[PDB]
Amino acid sequence: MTATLRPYLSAVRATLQAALCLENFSSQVVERHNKPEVEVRSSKELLLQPVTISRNEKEKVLIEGSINSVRVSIAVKQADEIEKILCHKFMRFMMMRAENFFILRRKPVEGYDISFLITNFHTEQMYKHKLVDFVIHFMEEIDKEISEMKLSVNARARIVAEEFLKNF
Amino acid sequence: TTALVCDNGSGLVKAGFAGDDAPRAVFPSIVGRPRHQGVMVGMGQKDSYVGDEAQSKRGILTLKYPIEHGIITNWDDMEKIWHHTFYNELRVAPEEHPTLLTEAPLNPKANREKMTQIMFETFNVPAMYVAIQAVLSLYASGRTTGIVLDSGDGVTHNVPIYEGYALPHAIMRLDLAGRDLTDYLMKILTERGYSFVTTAEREIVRDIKEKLCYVALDFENEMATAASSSSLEKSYELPDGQVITIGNERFRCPETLFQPSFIGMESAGIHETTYNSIMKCDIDIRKDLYANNVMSGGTTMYPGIADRMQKEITALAPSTMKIKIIAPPERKYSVWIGGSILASLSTFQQMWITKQEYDEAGPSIVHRKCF
Amino acid sequence: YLMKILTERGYSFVTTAEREIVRDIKEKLCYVALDFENEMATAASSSSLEKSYELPDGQVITIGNERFRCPETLFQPSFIGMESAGIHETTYNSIMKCDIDIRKDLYANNVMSGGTTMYPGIADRMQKEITALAPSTMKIKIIAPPERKYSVWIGGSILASLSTFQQMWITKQEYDEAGPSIVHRKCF
Amino acid sequence: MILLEVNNRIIEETLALKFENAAAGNKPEAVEVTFADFDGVLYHISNPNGDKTKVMVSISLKFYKELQAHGADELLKRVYGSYLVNPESGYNVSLLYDLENLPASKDSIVHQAGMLKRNCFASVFEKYFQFQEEGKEGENRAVIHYRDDETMYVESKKDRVTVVFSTVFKDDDDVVIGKVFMQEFKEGRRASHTAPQVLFSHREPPLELKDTDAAVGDNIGYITFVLFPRHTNASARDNTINLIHTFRDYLHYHIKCSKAYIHTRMRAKTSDFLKVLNRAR
Numbered sequence A: 001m002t003a004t005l006r007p008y009l010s011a012v013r014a015t016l017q018a019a020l021c022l023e024n025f026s027s028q029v030v031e032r033h034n035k036p037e038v039e040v041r042s043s044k045e046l047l048l049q050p051v052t053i054s055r056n057e058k059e060k061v062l063i064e065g066s067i068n069s070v071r072v073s074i075a076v077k078q079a080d081e082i083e084k085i086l087c088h089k090f091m092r093f094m095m096m097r098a099e100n101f102f103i104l105r106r107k108p109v110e111g112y113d114i115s116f117l118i119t120n121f122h123t124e125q126m127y128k129h130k131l132v133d134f135v136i137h138f139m140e141e142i143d144k145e146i147s148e149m150k151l152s153v154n155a156r157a158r159i160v161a162e163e164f165l166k167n168f
Numbered sequence B: 001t002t003a004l005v006c007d008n009g010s011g012l013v014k015a016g017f018a019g020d021d022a023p024r025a026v027f028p029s030i031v032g033r034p035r036h037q038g039v040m041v042g043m044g045q046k047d048s049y050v051g052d053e054a055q056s057k058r059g060i061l062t063l064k065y066p067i068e069h070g071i072i073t074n075w076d077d078m079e080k081i082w083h084h085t086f087y088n089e090l091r092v093a094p095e096e097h098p099t100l101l102t103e104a105p106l107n108p109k110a111n112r113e114k115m116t117q118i119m120f121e122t123f124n125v126p127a128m129y130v131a132i133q134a135v136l137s138l139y140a141s142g143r144t145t146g147i148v149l150d151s152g153d154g155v156t157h158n159v160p161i162y163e164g165y166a167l168p169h170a171i172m173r174l175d176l177a178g179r180d181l182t183d184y185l186m187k188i189l190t191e192r193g194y195s196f197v198t199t200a201e202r203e204i205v206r207d208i209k210e211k212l213c214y215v216a217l218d219f220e221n222e223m224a225t226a227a228s229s230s231s232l233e234k235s236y237e238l239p240d241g242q243v244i245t246i247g248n249e250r251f252r253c254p255e256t257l258f259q260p261s262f263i264g265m266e267s268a269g270i271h272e273t274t275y276n277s278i279m280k281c282d283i284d285i286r287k288d289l290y291a292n293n294v295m296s297g298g299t300t301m302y303p304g305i306a307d308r309m310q311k312e313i314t315a316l317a318p319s320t321m322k323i324k325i326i327a328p329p330e331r332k333y334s335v336w337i338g339g340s341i342l343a344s345l346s347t348f349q350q351m352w353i354t355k356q357e358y359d360e361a362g363p364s365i366v367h368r369k370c371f
Numbered sequence C: 001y002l003m004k005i006l007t008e009r010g011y012s013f014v015t016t017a018e019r020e021i022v023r024d025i026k027e028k029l030c031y032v033a034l035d036f037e038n039e040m041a042t043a044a045s046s047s048s049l050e051k052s053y054e055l056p057d058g059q060v061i062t063i064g065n066e067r068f069r070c071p072e073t074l075f076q077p078s079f080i081g082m083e084s085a086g087i088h089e090t091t092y093n094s095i096m097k098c099d100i101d102i103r104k105d106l107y108a109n110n111v112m113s114g115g116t117t118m119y120p121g122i123a124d125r126m127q128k129e130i131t132a133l134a135p136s137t138m139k140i141k142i143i144a145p146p147e148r149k150y151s152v153w154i155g156g157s158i159l160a161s162l163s164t165f166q167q168m169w170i171t172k173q174e175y176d177e178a179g180p181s182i183v184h185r186k187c188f
Numbered sequence D: 001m002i003l004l005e006v007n008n009r010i011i012e013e014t015l016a017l018k019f020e021n022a023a024a025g026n027k028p029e030a031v032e033v034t035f036a037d038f039d040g041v042l043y044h045i046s047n048p049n050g051d052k053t054k055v056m057v058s059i060s061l062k063f064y065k066e067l068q069a070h071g072a073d074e075l076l077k078r079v080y081g082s083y084l085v086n087p088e089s090g091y092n093v094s095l096l097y098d099l100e101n102l103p104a105s106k107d108s109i110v111h112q113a114g115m116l117k118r119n120c121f122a123s124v125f126e127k128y129f130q131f132q133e134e135g136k137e138g139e140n141r142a143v144i145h146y147r148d149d150e151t152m153y154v155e156s157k158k159d160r161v162t163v164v165f166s167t168v169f170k171d172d173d174d175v176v177i178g179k180v181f182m183q184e185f186k187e188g189r190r191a192s193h194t195a196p197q198v199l200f201s202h203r204e205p206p207l208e209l210k211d212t213d214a215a216v217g218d219n220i221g222y223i224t225f226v227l228f229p230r231h232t233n234a235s236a237r238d239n240t241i242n243l244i245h246t247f248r249d250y251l252h253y254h255i256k257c258s259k260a261y262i263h264t265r266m267r268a269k270t271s272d273f274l275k276v277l278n279r280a281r
Helices: A005-018 A081-098 A121-125 A130-157 A160-164 B052-056 B078-090 B111-121 B136-141 B199-212 B219-226 B249-255 B270-280 B305-316 B331-342 B355-360 C002-009 C016-029 C036-043 C087-097 C103-108 C122-131 C148-159 C172-177 D009-024 D062-066 D073-079 D110-133 D172-184 D236-244 D247-261 D263-280
Strands: A050-054 A060-065 A069-075 A115-119 B012-015 B025-028 B031-034 B061-063 B099-102 B127-131 B145-151 B156-162 B172-174 B234-237 B243-246 C051-054 C060-063 D032-035 D043-046 D054-059 D093-098 D142-144 D150-157 D160-167 D197-199 D224-226
Touching (some): A005 A130, A160 D172, B136 B331, B270 B305, D009 D110, D110 D160, D247 D263
Parallel strands (some): B099 B127
Antiparallel strands (some): D054 D093, D142 D150, D197 D224
């Protein structure tokens, strides 16, 4: 198994234990309507560090955090058009279904390959750490699914003469 | 850290890493897919149960090991099993680590392109080369020179080596495997009067056989004995609470290696057929070869066969020279471990095609106008 | 060796009764390559160097350049991994054992016989290769007539006229008489 | 279901209705047509001659200049010069079905007249057939630029009738199929145990016409198509010409049919992750 993934995502979840921070405040100088706080960050001392975290040499994460709301973005080794544009027939397909799950910073963001918008609301909405114990790892499983589409698509390459010529 | 070494072949899969003492990634090199209306529809099952899970479910499944023009032909069904390796055995990418692949003698033309098409466009390895499996055995023995038998579940071959220089006309590849045995063997159940005899019981047949079979010591003595005895007959549980007690078949059908002629097949019997390697070989060496007779496979773990085949071979042979016949404990299991340990001679890598060579022309850098 | 080769075509088809077909199409269609590396280079660009026939139900097999690939082992026992002199080398070992006293007599007396000499490509290539080792002006006129195949019987049907031989015969008398262990300096 | 005919659904049914109407002596409504097919067609149809009792089909293509150069005309003077007709302007040629050009058995021509497209192609392919039959190499090749990011010619040899190609690759995701799956045709026919020679060529046009390895290690399909006489008989021929007069055009449409399809898997998959995403609870 890719076992330094264990150091990797155990340290992700140690960061997401050091800093399960996100809790609310509204206003003290400007309006009560809690914002995309990670976008609208004015100043440092109130808030989490801006950060980036390589897995190797192409692969890395960005995380950035207001004390109440957060970005993630994640980068992948793959770089062929046959890796990218083909899975981007899906990453097109993906984004309306982001509207059916509400926490994407809804784009396949470059330098990385994706991004996320995360907030304190969720901490009050249903549950506790089973949440991040799902999320952080589900995020690998949806990568292992690329292997699922891989043999699928490669077998669509195995559609080819298997129709046209095999008619005869 | 690693470079990738496998029994990618027939029987079970028997893979590990470079340099290990043992293959470990191990389950049948065959897989099943539901033969059924899934009447509890939506019960959350994927379309296959694989080797050990195939067996856990074998009453459910359709399964494949294609035409005897090869071992298989839609190798793109090990398609699935490539992932079943990469994740379901391992959770790793081949694309990470230098890979030791393997293939047999005399594969018909298209093999190595059609292979490497996958192995680099798909398995994307840093760099690789492909071995032939015979001398892997001698590596474990710490040897180079003698006659090497394979008989297996894919195939058979019979392989003279001399620190290399192995004989293109006296190495003897053959389609034969334990694969084949059962077609005669299982017709006997109507002699047994069993109104109940199928495809899926072939694995139990093979079981009982792997538990209790042996090759007859001097077969008409055995036939006269079966005609006069039933201590032969030995008991065996069956899955509802039954037993069957059976056991003359247990060495009767184990004559067919000398008698392919049983199906009316015009092939000579085993050692006689094999001798022709030596007959085509150099003649001088045939003294010294008495000490160099190396024998192995899962198919090789039976009782009685050893002394039989020796005396059988001896019916072909002169006396005159000092024998050693050479067949180790675990010879069945062993071959992957010798081939695993080769990679320690890091020299073995330098042959490697990298993905660049494969990219640039194509695997037209190495395929089969190449020798 | 051709049947070892035809594993290229990869169906597991493997015995004498099929070989008796392979031999058929060999004895129909094989020819000695004239320029073989360039014939291989040609096959790799004009595909027209494979050839085919229907096997007896409808089953055509295409079979390749084998047709003249394999028709170079004569020069090249080395293909069959072999210590043997090539055809021409073997011939030239005998011409070396011969003499410039007779080498025109050798280079003139190019007389063929039998089924083997009936192939295409061969006398063409070998006129070329003989000439490529010969002196100039040598009449490398390969005496390869139609049915050199049967020159054996035809020569007997002619020369039975010289019935003198019928008295050089061992009579049934001499035979019945013999005490036959003696004979191996009449025979040798 | 995905199949086609050389006569057109659109045309046959309407004009057989016009000829049901012609048998009835019926009065018009305003038809004029232009449209397209495979092979770069400009179809046309009309109410020609102004009046209440005529119809005319017409057609135009640039590379007609490469084609009128050849004696296609004579078979067509049989099959369709059975009918009484004249070329229109702007079109290469036209079929006047004047309603007084119609026979007693008005149906019988309709199929034939509709199938005319491929049949015009066949009317000239017959010359390379005749060249092969007369034992002739290299004869009188029909170099046509039907397409031009592509190339073709028809030619002959004594054993075998022939066509040759070129076509420029646009995307590597295409090339990765192109330089693989036809090499499981050029090395794979056991389950499809019929085909003539077809050589898709990721770089390689044949030698009397262009020359081999004329592409970017893979970026131009110089496909080639050559017939055994188990095709060049007066029968197995026809089946096959039909396929060819659509093949790669039709294929490159099937591509997208199949592109669409995967989104079943993807619908299922993406819906699955929408299920999976709950499980954080």
